[PDB]
Design a binder for this molecule. Structure first.
Ligand SMILES: *C(=O)N1C[C@H](NOS(=O)(=O)O)CC[C@H]1C(N)=O
Length: 250
């Protein structure tokens, strides 16, 4: 377990990082206190909810659709019968809300418990209704479910090392749709951003969680900001993560 200084890459933004290679159990940690602190996963939960939907047969493949009903949304790309692959990359809220609401709460509870997914607290199934966004809410978006960056890495590793009961075919669908292009063909990067604002503490929850493969070695990682600046988003934290990968993991 190595404590490291990645502050140079964070360019003044408050956050932490954890990279884990489970082959040689090398844990690299920047800001250990933050890395151990549970927060809402926000849209990073789509990694797990995709697998839930696949396992329960709500969806079947990266082409699978959820039956768009014509509702008007400001994001162009949400206004169509988009596939799993597109809904994942566009973080289409209605697609993933419809998906999870076809699954009974006990099945979700048991999968989160099996994955050790943070506090596994789905008690506020409907999410943070006080923000006014109604059905564009859920337990995973600044609501009851909370997970630490370290626990995210532990979950990612369990899934992608094949230590869960999720089907290999379903894991590979997730892998496909999480693949990122980082303009470096000598590393494969996979991940998902998340963005939320913690109203209680007046800080962002900005995430980039995923994995990294470079010549036989795989690193599971989670980068997380808790800055008080609302301009700090998951996309911004993904930039930071990419800088760290290019600097230290090439
Ligand atoms: C998830 O974090 N969300 C869904 C969507 N995607 O965010 S991302 O660009 O960080 O991946 C918009 C923000 C957020 C939400 N408010 O639902």
């Amino acid at each position: 377990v190595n404590i490291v200084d990645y502050s140079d890459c964070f360019e003044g933004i408050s956050g932490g990082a954890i990279f884990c290679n489970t082959k040689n159990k090398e844990y690299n940690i920047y800001n250990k206190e933050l890395i151990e602190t549970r927060r809402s996963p926000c849209s990073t939960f789509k990694i797990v909810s995709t697998l839930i939907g696949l396992e329960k047969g709500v969806i079947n493949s990266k082409e699978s659709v959820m039956g768009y009903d014509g509702t008007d949304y400001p994001n162009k790309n949400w206004n169509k019968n988009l596939s799993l692959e597109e809904a994942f990359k566009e973080s289409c809220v209605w697609y993933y809300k419809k998906l999870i609401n076809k699954v009974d709460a006990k099945s979700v509870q048991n999968i989160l418990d099996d994955l050790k997914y943070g506090n596994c607290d789905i008690s506020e199934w409907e999410g943070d209704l006080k923000n006014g966004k109604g059905h564009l809410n859920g337990f995973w978006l600044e609501s009851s479910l909370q997970i630490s960056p370290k626990e995210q890495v532990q979950t990612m590793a369990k899934i992608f090392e094949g230590d869960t009961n999720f089907k290999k075919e379903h894991i590979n669908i997730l892998r496909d749709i999480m693949a990122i292009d980082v303009n470096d063909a000598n590393i494969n990067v996979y991940g998902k951003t998340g963005t939320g604002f913690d109203e209680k503490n007046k800080r962002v929850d900005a995430w980039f969680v995923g994995m990294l493969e470079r010549e036989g070695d795989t690193y599971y990682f989670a980068i997380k900001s808790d800055d008080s600046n609302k301009e700090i988003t998951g996309p911004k934290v993904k930039e930071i993560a990419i800088n760290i990968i290019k600097k230290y993991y090439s």
